[model samples]
Target: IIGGKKSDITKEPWAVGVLVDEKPFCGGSILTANFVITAAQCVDGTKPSDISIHYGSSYRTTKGTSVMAKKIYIVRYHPLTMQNNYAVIETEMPIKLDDKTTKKIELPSLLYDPEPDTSVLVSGWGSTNFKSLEYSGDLMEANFTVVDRKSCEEQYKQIEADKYIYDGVFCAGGEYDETYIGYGDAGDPAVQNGTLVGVASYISSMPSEFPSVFLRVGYYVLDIKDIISGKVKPQ
Candidate 1:
């Protein structure tokens, strides 16, 4: 079940259509007028020629016109892992954000550690639970409470063993009915305070199941901002 109060930020335009062969493959967030950030896995095995991006609405078949991707930018770490990790698609033409249907969500400037009682919202068209990979055409959201870094580190340490859950990466969710981001939900935004804080990354099915993991924005603040400022190559 969705955990947070409903808001317009959870609606369309801020949401993106990630499609393959007229079918919605995953969800994405519009980071700028021309660039959209999605899970690296979304584009991992696919070629740029095979995919299309749609904004202005969420419906894959009729919400808006499809835009050809000019180029696809995958994170440096993606190729080494089989994981569909992270990538940004540059549209052939800029999408107008001033239109009433398109609105920008604020991105977090600092690492936020929500109090245990505070809730964050995660929305996408992914499966409602594990063991299923079905994609939900209509959007869905779940409320998750923020958990402290130390607790998360301890919780994930058994599986991640030698891997790092950096200071930028904070964990959220709970046991029993805790929301999770699965296959088709890759690259969707986890918003807190109407700001984009996390980008869905991975999920675990081990001891004490929890919600999905994310590439915390605060961890890659410089890189993300640099891309937006045109200081770093996005393509």
Candidate 2:
């Protein structure tokens, strides 16, 4: 979020900081009072006892209401390709949604499809510069234009031959100078018209100015619904 501006948790109420061993390691979205969604890679192979969610806070370090993860659920996650890069964390206790800085996000429909150049807002406390070791202490937000699926595929191939856009993955943000996602932003929510549409997944190194990749939320709407309703078990 190098070119992004400062944001408040009230502006992105569903946003949460994913903490590993009490350190902010990634971003997440509150799906319900008890369920939180993040990138599968963020908590892969990690124990629930060691992870926590920092809710209702704009400041990265200050604990607004930290809740330890009770269970971690990752469905259809691909280790190599990073496809289906979504994880749902069941908190030890329900998050008290105050309808202000603490609230749940609305999910997009399964059939919802955004066209190219569709405006999307992404907020997080990730690094502000490329290859930076430190992440931002305050929440940051920036606008992104959705890249078409075909073009998004081409953009990645432009930098690496082996890299390919997966089926449930999409791309956005590459128009602005350094205004792209960086480290610790993984699992941050990408919203279009206030509906959660995507989750931060991957980004290229300094190799090329590429659009950030995300797991399309629409593609997994039903799966997320089932998970939240206790119909599907976490893998």
Candidate 3:
């Protein structure tokens, strides 16, 4: 994350890296031994054969369990406004959650959304610079305050298209230009009170001017539950 400090895997145990062609491409959060949550855009245009997950490691390239993706599910993604920008991945093998370096993040209670101005923590292996392709070797984390959805929508709609901030989206950070999540952080986890509340989705065109957008995990708790239980098929 931009302007964030180096973080250890043990500190953010649920954070995992989505590796495309063996390179760290995006971030993800573990839901279960066999399930991972990320952004639809992260796995878009990619086959399961070309994807892998790196977990239980502080460094992106070493000391982690690298498991192939057996399947990918982009659940109810809206390409137009980018709403419901979530995806679930089934691991080829069960993730070894030793409760230390690797573990599952707590899901938000059904339909529970954190309020604006709530303090949250985000963790990822994304670059510190938005234009730079060089990502950090170790996991990085930063704290950000949640911004109200309406305010976020107004700021975003002015710069882009109207209705860009849909119901499934929330906002955080952008309070300062230096305190924002950077490039390659998509699909990362935003935690509030130890609950997985958001997935990195979109950002404002002007850096630090508007809060970054995230797919609110609470908005799709029922759908995610269905996917995890095999009651619904990922599209």
Ranked by TM-score, the better of candidates 1 and 3 is: 3
Please, what are the lDDT tens digits per residue for candidate 2 over residues 40-96?
A: 988987889988899988998695999999988889788677778899999999998
lDDT of each: 0.63, 0.84, 0.82
Ranking of models by lDDT: 2, 3, 1
TM-score of each: 0.79, 0.93, 0.93
Residue range 1-235, candidate 3, lDDT tens digits: 7778989998999999988874448899999999999988788657888999999999976788899998888776776767778899999999999999999998998766668878678999878866776778889998877888888778777866546587787788885535576677888899988889998974434555567778888889988888888987654
User: With candidate 1 superimposed using the best TM-score fit, by how many Å does residue 24's alpha carbon deviate from the native?
Assistant: 8.9
Candidate 3's error at 78, in angstroms? 2.0
Q: In candidate 3, what residue range of length 10 has the lowest lDDT sum?
A: 201-210
For lDDT, the strongest prediction is 2
Poorest stretch of ten by lDDT in candidate 1:
1-10
Model 1, residue pairs in steric clash: 3-143, 40-85, 40-86, 41-84, 41-85
Model 2: residues with Cα > 4 Å off, grouped in runs = 22-24, 161-164, 176-178, 204-208
